[PDB]
């Protein structure tokens, strides 16, 4: 009597364990979470199997997904939208001076200010208003590309950094690219 | 030309038999429940579900020990057995745990309902219940149908969880593969909404067929002590054909 | 402490129930056959074997359509599907066709023997046969046991042949792989004596357990019209546990 | 009534074939589930390993 | 004879419950930690696909 | 001691760097 009210209450517990074990020890649910993300985009000349919800790397670390790979039929080039993160890839509340003290360091250098149009406060005030919000860690001379890990794995996007005096703001098109190579590419280029 | 005439008479009665079992299902689910209907559903979850817990948990382990032992013997020649944790949890989650756990539910708790409602029909308990005024479909049959649609998708998850844990035992701890590359091979390739949810929707369509058949065969018996036992093999055969039949249709849609 | 006392009393009766079924097997096979014993074995091959031919051939096709559709969805990402004809004929020949064709034989022709010998026990045909002097083990039981050990290994081959032909239909003729690389991928990787013979020896050990259980449960019933139907679920459960239990032991020996 | 039963039985199986030929088209496995298709062709000198249903 | 019918009850229910801990231990959901470990660190410039808990 | 930092590293050499250098 009370057994049949209890021995069902155990059956929902053992289902409760073996459902929680599937979601957060086997399936990828706990590992995918876009921490206050935003969206940028790019245009490619070859996307040979860049499957959606792939990964994007900066230095070999997961900082983004993939959402849509459609053609641009006025140029017949690709169009990828990737959502990065707002804590791994941007400068947070304390960090806002670290990019204004770097804009004053290497960008507002006097040998660099005496290489352009003559002023005293034009770029000096712009680096306080443009740099405060809508700004990521990606220096604008960082060209995204498609890569793969190993020789069997899926396609993933790689952002190679370097240089850079302005940072890509928000929703911007990453400047240069390069496509993915396979057998139809390599042996026609190995010569 | 009698054998052809007997064969055509056989499949005409089996076609009409579907139409009675379809009209029986529309009378059960299109009704607001009578007073006291939840107290019997909790009790019928004990008979169908909890008694079936021992066979599924033990037999789910024995498939996991086989899938880890067969997947290692193939993936060691190509030398790539960081995908061992993927192919074990991909064989179970989308394919074997929806199918095998419905072939054991049709035997243990499927055919037991046909004996239970069947022995009530030969000993005139169903006919006696109706003259009091109580309708035996709402009273007896309907708490058994809803305890079958609920108790099987709760059992393929326990089948799939014990099968992976059993496959982790013979793969990692006995044959000697890396434990960290076992689990990290899973979270890359095994999504939740495409694989674990599509392994649950595949078992709700299976739980409807292994219960609506196993109830109809025990309600439309012929009342005879050897007519009951001929309808308990009619409900293990017809369940195992509709499980494997709706397997290919649901696989082609979900993974095509 | 009654529930632990009832639980210990349950598994002691189930242990001495094994010892009766072991002594029943040594009385059947250690005897030279009576005159007329081959005429009943040919008839009992009709009931057990030939009636089971329709379910196995149809359900063997439905697994082949699934194995060709699931193996293509995985092997197209790694781009190597000249191994499609290997993994289809390697999943069936050593693993699925010995196991699944014993889970459908326990249902259809396994439990039907327990109803057949069981209804002879409640209606006193077994007790009446003995007073004439005819021993009912040699007369009734023994042509049913030898028709079970023969008819299942003849049925896993028909299961495995129809499963590969069905897998060739959805792989080559519907999804569009090469026909010549399908078949030539088989003869390289699939030996005969290591794979097809070891898939037959695995089903002779399975045919002994799904028949010696299904005969003993119908011989040692309790004669009661609702005591028969409780022994037809005791023989589907116990067969499906010994099939999956002797699966792992035979896999570890043959492919370890 | 028996006739009624029969009917309500021929309507299940006919609905059971209407589903099997819906789920076989949306799977991609039969027919052409891509819209308003127009056909072009070309002339090669050597096309190895190229079946129909290619990309 | 009740001590014979109750010794089997405990000797089963030990095996039925101690096997749940062994199935909870090897699922990684309980424990899984080393003995007096510590934590170093290093800083790379390109970790091409080094997932956590790798060896 | 425990808790310290190893500081002499090198990064991964991937095939998009290697095969393009292997030319």
Numbering used by the authors:
A (entry chain J): 3 to 193
B (entry chain D), C (entry chain A): 1 to 256
D (entry chain K), E (entry chain I): 3 to 57
F (entry chain I): 171 to 193
What did the study's authors say about this model?
The MlaFEDB complex is an ATP-binding cassette transporter to actively translocate the phospholipids between the inner membrane and the periplasmic protein MlaC4,5. The MlaFEDB-mediated glycerophospholipid (PL) transport was reported to play an important role in maintaining the integrity of the lipid membrane. In summary, we characterize four structures of the A. baumannii MlaFEDB complex in nucleotide-free and vanadate-trapped conformations using single-particle cryo-EM.
To understand the mechanism of glycerophospholipid translocation coupled with the conformational change, distinct conformations of MlaFEDB were trapped using sodium ortho-vanadate. Three individual conformations were classified and refined to 4.0, 3.6, and 4.0 Å, and were named Vtrans1, Vtrans2, and Vclose, respectively. All three structures display bound nucleotides at the ATP-binding sites. However, the maps are of insufficient quality to distinguish between ADP, ATP, and ADP–vanadate. Comparison of Vtrans1 and Vtrans2 to nucleotide-free structure shows the conformational rearrangement of the MlaD. MlaD hexametric ring rotates clockwise at different levels, whereas MlaFEB remains unchanged. The three vanadate-trapped structures of MlaFEDB reveal different levels of conformational rearrangement of MlaD and MlaE coupled with nucleotide binding and glycerophospholipid translocation.
